[PDB]
RNA sequence: AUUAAACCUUGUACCUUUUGCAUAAUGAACUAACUAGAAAACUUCUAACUAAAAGAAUUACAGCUAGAAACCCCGAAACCAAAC
RNA sequence: AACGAGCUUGGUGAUAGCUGGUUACCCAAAAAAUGAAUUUAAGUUCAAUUUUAAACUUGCUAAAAAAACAAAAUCAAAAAGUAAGUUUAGAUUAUAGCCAAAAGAGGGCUCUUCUGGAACGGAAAAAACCUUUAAUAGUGAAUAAUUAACAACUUAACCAUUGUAGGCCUAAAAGCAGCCACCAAUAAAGAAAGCGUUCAAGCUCAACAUAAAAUCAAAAUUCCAUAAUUUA
RNA sequence: CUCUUAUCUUUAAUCAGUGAAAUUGACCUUUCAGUGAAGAGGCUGAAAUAUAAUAAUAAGACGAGAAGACCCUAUGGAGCUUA
RNA sequence: UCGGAGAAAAUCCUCCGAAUGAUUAUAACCUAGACUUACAAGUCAAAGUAAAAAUAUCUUUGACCCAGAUAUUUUGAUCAACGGACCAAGUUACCCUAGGGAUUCCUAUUUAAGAGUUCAUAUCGACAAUUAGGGACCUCGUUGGAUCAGGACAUCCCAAUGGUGUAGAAGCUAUUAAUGGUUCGUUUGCAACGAUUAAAGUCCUACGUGAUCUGAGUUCAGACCGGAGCAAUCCAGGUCGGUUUCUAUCUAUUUACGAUUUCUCCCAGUACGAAAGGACAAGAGAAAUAGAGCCACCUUACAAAUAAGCGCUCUCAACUUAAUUUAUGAAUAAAAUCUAAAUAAAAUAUAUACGUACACCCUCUAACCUAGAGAAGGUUA
């Protein structure tokens, strides 16, 4: 229940997805010392960072790719506009 | 077999999701020409990793300590 | 012989069924579209002239109800009236209304209702009309105008004398 | 005979109303796809099975980032019916080395670079 | 599962086969004991010594020597020889 | 004491391409029932698959033009998404499928080609349809498929006279046996539309007048969940 | 036989003594309709339903036993006859 | 076995040929790379060398072993079951083992040319309609009876009705209804026949039903004819003879009902009808069968005080409903209309509202009993 409504609000459809309820720490020592990070959170942090790096890599390759094609066209344009030697005519050349 | 009301809606919902999929596949960021070669280096390195592992198979080292450590099975308090 | 369709195909048919557009208000419940200009058929215009002609030609117009008497017996009345040079005219009432609405005769509209016959002549043989009326007892007379004067049956009887 | 299908090109030519409905500009197209598998490849032909593994969509409801380039799009069109394609959006820009560990992909399709788990205030 | 043995809920015995299917068809009253994979030509692994290895006869253009590693049980109608 | 050929011992642990059986745990991979030959189709050998180990390098998806055809596969530049592939050494088992959906060919079966399937959920029970990436412990959560579905609308008042029983074999056929053309009067009426016909007279419809409306609709044991038309 | 009956004996049944056989996966062993291989005590859906003996019936448990019947197979036999 | 051709890469799919010869300028050796192919076998070929001074041109098949012929080189298969055993046929019902199996015209609707003197639909009815239901060649593919029946209605009789080419009476056709009933013989492989009946229905229930019984076949061991075969034997050809047993473990079952039909009489020889002929309904009495009982008589027994039928007696009501027919009455201006309008009625077979029966509350040493297997039950001055 409530999956679609949660999606409209920008939340995860499943309350067990991304949010304070799951991602926040579940306990800490009475003295106040923070608890060791939960294994699920550590895994989830690892996967999220792995996806973040992939986003950077693909964009750079595509952005670097278009610039390569851009400068290549200039060379083709320059190659066409070239000539050498001279152009005599008439009865001798 | 008359088709149920719930059955009809669930198909329509899926069709709308696929209908949107049409829209997002209609605007390629790069053209076919621009694509050529932009990922050549990464592909080249990836295969080298594949080959290196494949051609690196060899037996493992053997140590004297493994064989001699068996004598510890008869270790005792004097 | 119909062959059963795969359920997935049957689902496809159900969702792709034609849906008609639905108006918010029924056209019948809405006010009726105004009538376009009508066309006069070649029955009213020609008959209109006939109504004009009979009024112009005949000074006296007296009205009597149609008796639904056998046409074999209408003939003898027509023949008897023809011998007295008095003619019979019958016309559709509805096309007779517009002229009777706007004409020299406008109080005869109640008379010109239902099946009727018209007593038309050029001479006021009004006394003889009763004699022709007396020939067939059951036929009544409703009234009309004699010599351009509108009067009822009882007044006509006094006028006849 | 059940065989691989070639879609007429008109399907992938959008209409002006489509841009308004989905809110995507025909210019400045998005760069990266967010693709999730939402159906099973069981009871589907083997060629559809192959592409799903090539694209990394073996697990359902787990998003994969892909390039919005024609070659990738060709594979996606093969399995269009088994997936949901959502444009990746970067409200706060690309993640940097500092923010690479603080990202989060929202259901809206937006990759935020700062994730606090605190009331917006 | 339950406070509660039974009530409530879930649940088409086993083996063998049949097309990968059991409401099929075989087999089983139950207990105890007995009751069915065995060989080294080539290959692989582990060592000795090495242009040589092997305690005689054999192999050898890195080989040769040794070790370890393997291939079921019950059942016909019959046939033949000699006795009764 | 079961002779188409006695009985006992031995050959003998006869042989059986046939039936039956073939004893601990855990992990991993996995064909297909295809082609070929066979006194071969209840079997076997080879190919093909699968598999273990090793060597080193491209494989899979895709694949423009372009040829080959006639006017969707074969081939496979560049790329891209991806991680498999080739070769050497060793090795069995297998070599009868089943059902659904497409295309054909013999004519519902029977074959050939292509795709999918083997729930612990659903379709009532349900190998084969649909939802379903493995395996776990938890008195958490979001979802998938999901046998149900919401009888029928120009014709209503009145009248019907006459040229003429009109040419015609027809006894006779006069609107209406027959055949013939197919105009007259009448404000209003067919040289007649269905009836009736010894034949005709005869029953109405259309004529005139007055008269109101307005295309199809989703058998045999004993019934078999109970029920229910509206709360967003 | 129409059309069966009566009586007596054997058997039966109760009591006393002795005491087998085929058979048997386990059973806490129901009816109806559906499903399914012509097929259901055990599956689906309805229904019925304190627990146990004794004596009877034979619809079902493809009821239990035989060296039965029919057809096909094996590079299994055997008897007989020949050209 | 192989080759050619269509379907087109399937087929018991449809055709033509070959186990070739002719023709000759005679057509070597050697050798890259390929085709085809499980294996085996089968194809194409550059370069080089050598003969000559263009290839052979038409367009296929048989392995190994083993035998031949020669001066090295050659030849041997309807081995056609054509991957080829060096050389072997029938028959078995006298049989055995190992297994695998099985056990077109109806009928109902739609249409309606023609039949019906006239007149489509009283009764029928071409051409058709219905996703409407049911039943290579010559040869040949379990069911009777007995017992007891359960069920369907697509009704044979009994009952209620519409129509008629229904005067009456006989008939024909339709609707509703499953109520109880639906015989005894002759012929004997069933197919007709005789005599009756109110009628002698059509079907489902693994021939409904062989652990209830029984006949024939399936069908054999014996034996004959007729035919086939040299014979042994054979025949989906005749005939005669010919042995399957079961003690019930489980489920299921084992204690009441309120009736059906025919005939005679009366109505009445009336109604109807020219006559001939000839009825309804209402009423009365008889039988038959079925069910339930009984023993005064009769009859048969125990040559018992009882049991039996061949003897005797008793059997009934319908709240509510289908086809159909009336009354009032709107939609629909009627002195219309039986109403999937509101209404009032009549009208099959069914059945259980409604009654009969049962109810009681339990002494029992024992004896006796018209109660009974046991137990239970009844009786006791
Ligand atoms: Mg068997
Ligand atoms: Mg003996
Ligand atoms: Mg053996
Ligand atoms: Mg065999
Ligand atoms: Mg052979
Ligand atoms: Mg490539
Ligand atoms: Mg449901
Ligand atoms: Mg005893
Ligand atoms: Mg019990
Ligand atoms: Mg019980
Ligand atoms: Mg049943
Ligand atoms: Mg049950
Ligand atoms: Mg008993
Ligand atoms: Mg029984
Ligand atoms: Mg049996
Ligand atoms: Mg064989
Ligand atoms: Mg070869
Ligand atoms: Mg050459
Ligand atoms: Mg052969
Ligand atoms: Mg052969
Ligand atoms: Mg061959
Ligand atoms: Mg004999
Ligand atoms: Mg009966
Ligand atoms: Mg009926
Ligand atoms: Mg029986
Ligand atoms: Mg005898
Ligand atoms: Mg018995
Ligand atoms: Mg009477």
What does this 3D model show about the protein?
This is part of a larger assembly, with chains A (93 residues), B (78 residues), C (161 residues) and D (121 residues). Chain B has 78 residues and is an all-alpha fold. Chain B is built from 4 helices and no strands. Chain B has helices at residues 5-24, 32-35, 40-54, 64-69. Chain B starts with a helix and ends in a 9-residue tail after the last helix. The relative contact order of chain B is 0.05. Chain C has a 5-stranded antiparallel beta sheet. By secondary structure, chain D is α+β, with helices and mostly antiparallel strands. Helices cover 21% and strands 16% of the residues of chain D. In chain D, the strands form 2 sheets. A 3-stranded antiparallel beta sheet of chain D has the order 2-1-3, covered by helices on one side. In chain D, strands 4-5 form a two-stranded antiparallel sheet. The radius of gyration of chain D is 17 Å and the shape is globular. Chains in contact: A-B, A-D, B-C, B-D. Chains A and D meet through helix 3 of A and strand 2 and strand 4 of D. The structure holds 4 RNA strands. Chain B: One of its GO terms (molecular function) is structural constituent of ribosome. Chain B: Belongs to the mitochondrion-specific ribosomal protein mL63 family. Chain B: Its main location: mitochondrion. Chain B: Keywords: Mitochondrion, Ribonucleoprotein, Ribosomal protein.
**What fraction strand of chain B?**
under 5%
The termini of chain D sit apart by 61 Å
Strand content of chain D: 15-25%
**What does the largest sheet of chain D look like?**
3 strands, antiparallel
Give the strand line-up of the largest sheet of chain D.
2-1-3
- Topology order of chain D in helix (H) and strand (E) letters: HEHEHEEE
**Total E-strand runs of chain D:** 5
Radius of gyration of chain D, whole Å:
17 Å
**Helicity level of chain B, as a percent range?**
55-70%
Query: Based on CA inertia axes, which overall geometry of chain B fits?
Result: elongated
Which two chains have the most extensive interface, and how many residues on each?
A-D, 24 and 21 residues
Assembly annotation:
part of a larger assembly
Q: What's the tally of helices of chain B? A: 4
